[PDB]
């Protein structure tokens, strides 16, 4: 039982970062514009958490992939996504190649797999 709980914490956390990237790719044009206009990373990071983003919404289904530590001010809150400072960082660290087609899918895929595991880990939690 100790293991299960861990895997859920390991899972939620991992998926948390992959969400932000799936949303980042869901609106790259505006993200790029925002970044190539920020004088510095630090500023681009602020701008990123500052304003919410349109969702990946269908896929994004289940309020369990979110970290038990995730503040209530973050995440999907009214059809809009609110990035954590840590997630914005992840988006800033992305390598252009990750924008290719096959690469975009590998993210969505892993994200969906995590959401699957997180699902069964809960059935297992409940049961």
């Amino acid at each position: 039982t100790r293991r299960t709980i861990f895997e859920l914490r390991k899972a939620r956390d991992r998926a948390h970062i992959l969400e932000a990237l799936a949303v980042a790719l869901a609106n790259i044009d505006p993200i790029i514009e925002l970044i190539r206009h920020a004088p510095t990373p630090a500023e681009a990071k602020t701008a990123l958490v500052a304003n919410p983003w349109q969702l990946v919404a269908a896929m994004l289904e289940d309020d369990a992939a979110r970290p038990e530590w995730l503040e209530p001010e973050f995440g999907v809150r009214d059809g809009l996504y609110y990035l954590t400072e840590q997630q914005a960082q992840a988006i800033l660290d992305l390598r252009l190649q990750k924008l290719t087609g096959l690469e975009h899918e590998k993210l969505l895929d892993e994200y969906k797999e995590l959401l699957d595991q997180i699902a069964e880990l809960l059935r297992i939690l409940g049961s």
Partner: protein, 99 residues
Amino acid sequence: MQFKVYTYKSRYRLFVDVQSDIIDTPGRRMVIPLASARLLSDKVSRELYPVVHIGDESWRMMTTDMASVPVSVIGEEVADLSHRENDIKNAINLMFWGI
């Protein structure tokens, strides 16, 4: 945890956990040893070998000494250098990518 500086418990006095917190190794951990700053000349690239203040002395990250550390050797958390994240990540990035 990533960006936290621990102690061994040797050769080096301190080390920085530079491994993603979203990657389980288990028992291991990628780290970058901290060398007392004086031991190097102010000429050395603060790009590849970043400097950080920890406690009452200045330290140099021996980026080229990057190595895995067995959790069994990890002592106690003694500082947080998360505010130096991009510099640490450029050190790392610059090593395998040169930029």
